[PDB]
Design a binder for this molecule. Sequence first.
Ligand code: HEM
Length: 81
Amino acid sequence: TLPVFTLEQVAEHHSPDDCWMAIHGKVYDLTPYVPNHPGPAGMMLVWCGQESTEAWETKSYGEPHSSLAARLLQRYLIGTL
Ligand code: HEM
């Protein structure tokens, strides 16, 4: 069954070399994905350790992530919030 985390635990993984996020009530360990993120360098890094649903939904300027990107995000799932 999926592990359950709190936002406080997610916040301990807040750096480029140890980056977890909470998106839509789910927790993801995105550390391996960090260097592969497309777009302007370092946009995902500001959200390591955070609840990041709005940034996920809008890319911070008003475009959603694609269905392809949503499949890629799900691979890094580690639990629920
Ligand atoms: C949560 C904070 C995130 C922010 C603010 C963010 C922002 C962005 C931006 C600015 C771009 C380029 C512009 C554009 O494609 O319209 C982009 C593209 C992309 N991002 Fe993110 N991203 C985030 C997280 C993620 C995560 C967690 C993944 C997957 C593991 C991901 C996967 C991708 C992919 C695959 C693209 C290429 C375009 C697409 O398929 O939608 N991003 N992102």
